[PDB]
Amino acid sequence: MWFEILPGIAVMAACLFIPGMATAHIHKFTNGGKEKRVAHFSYQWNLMERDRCISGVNRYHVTKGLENID
Amino acid sequence: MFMINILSLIIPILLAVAFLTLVERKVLGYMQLRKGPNVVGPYGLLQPIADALKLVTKEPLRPGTSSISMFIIAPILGLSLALTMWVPLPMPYPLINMNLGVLFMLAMSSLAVYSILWSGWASNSKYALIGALRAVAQTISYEVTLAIILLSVLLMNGSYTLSTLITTQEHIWMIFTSWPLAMMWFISTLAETNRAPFDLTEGESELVSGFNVEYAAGPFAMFFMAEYANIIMMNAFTAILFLGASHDPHTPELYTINFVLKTLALTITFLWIRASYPRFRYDQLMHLLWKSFLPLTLALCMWHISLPIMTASIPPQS
Amino acid sequence: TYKFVNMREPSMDMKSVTDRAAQTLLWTELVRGLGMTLSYLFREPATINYPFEKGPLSPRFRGEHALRRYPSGEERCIACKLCEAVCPAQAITIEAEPRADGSRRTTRYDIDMTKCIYCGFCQEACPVDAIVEGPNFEFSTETHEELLYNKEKLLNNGDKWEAEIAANIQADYLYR
Amino acid sequence: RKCDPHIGLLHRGTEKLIEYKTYLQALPYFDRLDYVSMMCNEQAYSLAVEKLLNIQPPPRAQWIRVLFGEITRLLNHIMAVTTHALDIGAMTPFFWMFEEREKMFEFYERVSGARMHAAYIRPGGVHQDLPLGLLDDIYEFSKNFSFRIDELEEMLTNNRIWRNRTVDIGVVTAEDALNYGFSGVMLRGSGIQWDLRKTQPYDVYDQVEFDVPIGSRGDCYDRYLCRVEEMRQSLRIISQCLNKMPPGEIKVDDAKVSPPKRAEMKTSMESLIHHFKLYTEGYQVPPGATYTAIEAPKGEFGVYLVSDGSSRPYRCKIKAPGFAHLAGLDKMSKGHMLADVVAIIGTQDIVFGEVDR
Amino acid sequence: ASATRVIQLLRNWASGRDLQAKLQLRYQEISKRTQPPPKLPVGPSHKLSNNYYCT
Amino acid sequence: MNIMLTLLTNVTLASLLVLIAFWLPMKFFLVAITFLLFDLEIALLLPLPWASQTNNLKTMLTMALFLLILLAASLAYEWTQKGLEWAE
Amino acid sequence: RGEYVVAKLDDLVNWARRSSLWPMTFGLACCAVEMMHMAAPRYDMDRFGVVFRASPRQSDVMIVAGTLTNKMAPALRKVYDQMPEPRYVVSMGSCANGGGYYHYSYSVVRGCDRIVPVDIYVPGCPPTAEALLYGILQLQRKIKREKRLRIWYRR
Amino acid sequence: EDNKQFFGRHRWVIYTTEMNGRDTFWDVDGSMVPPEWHRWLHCMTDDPPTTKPPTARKYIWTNHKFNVSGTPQQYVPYSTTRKKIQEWVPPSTPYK
Ligand SMILES: CCCCCCCCCCCCCCCCCC(=O)OC[C@H](COP(=O)([O-])OCC[N+](C)(C)C)OC(=O)CCCCCCCCCCCCCCCCC
Ligand code: SF4
Ligand code: SF4
Ligand code: SF4
């Protein structure tokens, strides 16, 4: 037979699964069901501080839209 | 918050490294017509635990000719490097989104050779010293092709951001565009990772153990695990580079399944490739590298820089 | 009759050079090597599951000396000492003495397991098929002393096995 | 530049004890001389002794000798080719056809009763008879062993790694090779046109047909191919002898050199004495000396057996086929890389039982 | 023997040979381990007459 | 910070599990120098990806390819005058 | 209880060591080839721990296979001291056990006991390949009946 | 037995959980096969003891021992010959 290596393979897939879901789900939990807003250039950065400072709770992820302005 | 993600990344990486010893002795055997570790643990699920436990309970020998200061920094310098190298890997959304991640991965890859260099000096034996001397010279000679292959590949991709890899490689695998460089890249991975036909040091009889000639259980855990640790990732780096998957923002599960399967399959080929080829002699390594691999890589970099200019296909860095 | 080996000539035509150039650039014989191992991966293993599975042997197997006994009960060895003379390693040590009944019987029969070689000469020596090499190999030890066998151990080995080795010489004495 | 292959690390004064023992007790020494091709050593000793004794083995024994001589021939190049690859650093092509050795290794258990040191071929024929049905099993093994060697050649010969690491390495000119005392694969691989069976036909080897795979250049690779082609030629010799099995006895019909049958052992007085004396001191070998030499699957194996005329040998100097072969390590490694040294050893298949006595 | 069809064609293709025709493990072609009594022949000179050791 | 935290945690894990494993129980020069010169020449064309998006990429084409042929030229002179065929 | 705690630790350490030995080959004669068949798939040993890591420094048990010579005597010995503990030596075959077929010879020391402390003896000339697998297995059970942490607790 | 399986593996066993006082559950060993089944298991013949009982004799062991080494039931070499040089046993009482 040959499939006796499959359970050795399968446990690895479980181990490598943890980083993929964790760093994704932790992103969802730390962004409130969203993803971490990437900032590869200055614009993507001061955009966050614009959103972080307006939220009032000093969190960029929470966003206030049309219900905020009049 | 952040720290719980750190253990959630490195810890499963470390536990996977211990298990890779099992398949190294098992899938080789199932190709060698052997059985592989089966008696201990159900289907050999517990052999890596047995392997790792004596290495952390056997006597740690410090030869009198070995500088204890150098004897301890090197295994830490190796294992830690492998773990921190994982932080920019683009697992759906990478833990570290370094816009220069490609350079970041390559930079500390060069830092790896200090692990063998210092160990060869720390061991301080005639045969041991030359074994490391003509081991480091191999790894450095393979980094120049490593950089050139990288430089050509992301030239068509865009910037050096490792997250951009999944964006450029949207519809077609990048291998279909740089397959002459893919095998150029793959063999380069086979040499930096110190595996046959470039096992060389860790060769069970090439250099008996090379970097582990006098270096036995105890601190040797952080010097025979690190090489296997780079194996899973440098193949995974190839998986991101040429075999990129799809990532749905509403379901990152698909890309986790696809990438892990792709990198696990590549590691099978990596374990496949040890059990099918002899070991290159030292002169043959440089002859293959400088005089056949090095010129071809330069020509392909010639081609891959003009082609976006040829077809107005320059990629957006932002 | 004879035959060369390395007398193949490489063809210089456009076709032949193309295959060689393709082989060098696009590694094909390397892939051929890969295919050979991979086809063997899907080949069933031949790993005997010791101790539960045990390797095959033949009714002629040689090991673990053991004196036998006649169907009446008296031991076979009449101290004819051909085994002692034959023994190419001189592992046998036999001292004779006239037993109270009158017939011979060895008062000392030590065969040093770690001088013996299991060549099977000793059974061919004594015409009464007194000493034979049994089918045992499972007598590895942890002290050097217990390997040094004596008359008492040899008889105990004989009484222990006997029945197994009884059929062995029954199916092999025709060949001898 | 300069190489000194120091030896003695296994040395046993083999012929020193040979003097004190008689011929029959001397036979297990030969099986332990080359621990790779064991029964081939038995062949050399038995030929030498029965050459002095002026007694020829029965035809049934002779056709057994080539069948087992080629069985040992199958063993050694598996030992030689695979570990030479293991010397280079190839693991799996070593193991695959290593398993096939347990097939006729099991055959050895069927005949002699032991596995390695058979003690089967003796002066005056062969000790025991072939067990019933074993010849069919030999055919079963032979019919499939050709496949495994196609697996070896495909894995090793064509691959560029095997060539570039081993070809053009350790070349040796024909005149230098022969004048160095080399033999067998050392000569035939390096252009020299000579094989013991074809030229000096001992035993029934003349009747069987085969080819001698000599080489053109004579490096480690050429020797490696010479070994694997002899393997195919060994299969040919196995095919012919196995189909040439005669009706005949296994040992000479001379009770002064051959033990009488166990049925006759316990039936007749002459048989009782003849086995008794043959198993006390052995047989009286007429004085003289000889150098009966046959090709071992590694090289030329011979013995200088000089007998005083008693029941025990006087002096038996054993030709070591690797004795001269290991002497060439100086030049075959000269002008070559360090890794080529083990390649020289691997293609020589240096076995530390003969070069060290 | 053992294996299934789709596996056989997989290893048949990867090796370029028909392994099912002849394999390297014995299944049923092995001769029966127990065998009839082997009545051995006699010596060429086994004769009650004109066989003196003078010859 | 996060970068410093990641590397710091890796060192402690390596340090921690090292401690439990210690208390609980001219050719050689030429390959170095040739790599050094090639590696330094390699660093020149590392900024190539963004340089490929310059507004005068025609001049980039002449000169980015310039360094690459010099890489070949340096090897070519090295190869022909022995060089990569290291002393043996 | 304390004795239970030291018993569980003893089992955990013993089970690891017995199940994953890393033997280093010291074959010198025909005793090497037959053990080397244990590497062959017929009696695979890598099924349980014993693997190709070799590297005499990274070795638990040493198998001394073949005849031992006086000129081989010191070089083999210095290997044994350099071998880190727990070090056990396996005596392979009649020659390494007590000299065997060359007991009365000038270039062989009778047995490996005169050189190294032999923990296990495997008779044979050569011992059958599977018989050594038994010898390794009985050595494995020998480790199972070890009370290192138990004997420390009594102290 | 499994005749469909390939040679060698075609016959296999699992041992008793209680072998002569000492348990064999994680104490697997090859030295518990009795003389009767030492043949059939090893493919030394095709005649299982259930279908071919061994020749019954009085001196044969009625209970097959394992490898007694390690246990206090080991073997110790000792001279089985008798001393042949006796002393003078000097007589007592008087003085010269
Ligand atoms: C419009 C088209 C534009 C592009 C066209 C480009 C040209 C056409 C394509 C050319 C071929 C592709 C590029 C070159 C590749 C070969 C490079 C080379 O040096 O080859 C010769 C080299 C050297 O061969 P050599 O040493 O025998 O000969 C070289 C020439 N002399 C002698 C003068 C020096 O071959 C190798 O390096 C062999 C492989 C070594 C590593 C061992 C493992 C191999 C594993 C193979 C199977 C797995 C593959 C995995 C692939 C990746 C998967 C993700
Ligand atoms: S088998 Fe040979 S060496 Fe062993 S006791 Fe019998 S005759 Fe002596
Ligand atoms: S040869 Fe046989 S009968 Fe003679 S002493 Fe030895 S065991 Fe007894
Ligand atoms: S015990 Fe026998 S097989 Fe082992 S080395 Fe000595 S003679 Fe050779």
Short mmCIF file of C-alpha atoms in Angstrom, two decimals, chain B residues 145 148-149 152 178-185 287-304, chain C residues 24-27, chain F residues 68 72 75 79:
data_model
loop_
_atom_site.label_atom_id
_atom_site.label_comp_id
_atom_site.label_asym_id
_atom_site.label_seq_id
_atom_site.Cartn_x
_atom_site.Cartn_y
_atom_site.Cartn_z
CA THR B 145 21.33 33.45 -8.79
CA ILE B 148 18.57 37.50 -10.01
CA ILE B 149 15.69 35.01 -10.27
CA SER B 152 13.23 39.02 -12.85
CA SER B 178 8.62 32.07 -16.27
CA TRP B 179 8.86 28.28 -16.35
CA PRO B 180 12.47 28.51 -17.67
CA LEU B 181 13.16 30.49 -14.50
CA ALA B 182 10.95 28.30 -12.29
CA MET B 183 13.27 25.29 -12.51
CA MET B 184 16.07 27.85 -12.37
CA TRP B 185 14.49 28.97 -9.10
CA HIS B 287 30.44 24.32 -12.61
CA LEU B 288 26.65 23.97 -12.61
CA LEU B 289 26.23 27.39 -10.98
CA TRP B 290 28.72 29.86 -12.40
CA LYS B 291 29.05 28.47 -15.92
CA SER B 292 25.55 27.13 -16.72
CA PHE B 293 23.06 28.43 -14.15
CA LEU B 294 24.56 31.91 -13.80
CA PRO B 295 24.70 32.78 -17.55
CA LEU B 296 21.20 31.43 -18.23
CA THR B 297 19.73 33.42 -15.34
CA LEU B 298 21.33 36.60 -16.70
CA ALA B 299 19.87 35.97 -20.15
CA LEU B 300 16.42 35.34 -18.70
CA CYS B 301 16.70 38.60 -16.75
CA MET B 302 17.61 40.19 -20.09
CA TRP B 303 14.37 38.80 -21.51
CA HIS B 304 12.08 39.58 -18.58
CA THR C 24 20.48 19.00 -21.26
CA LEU C 25 18.21 22.05 -21.05
CA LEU C 26 14.89 20.31 -20.32
CA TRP C 27 16.08 17.67 -17.87
CA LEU F 68 23.35 43.07 -17.18
CA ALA F 72 27.98 38.83 -18.40
CA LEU F 75 31.87 36.59 -15.99
CA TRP F 79 35.56 32.40 -17.55
#
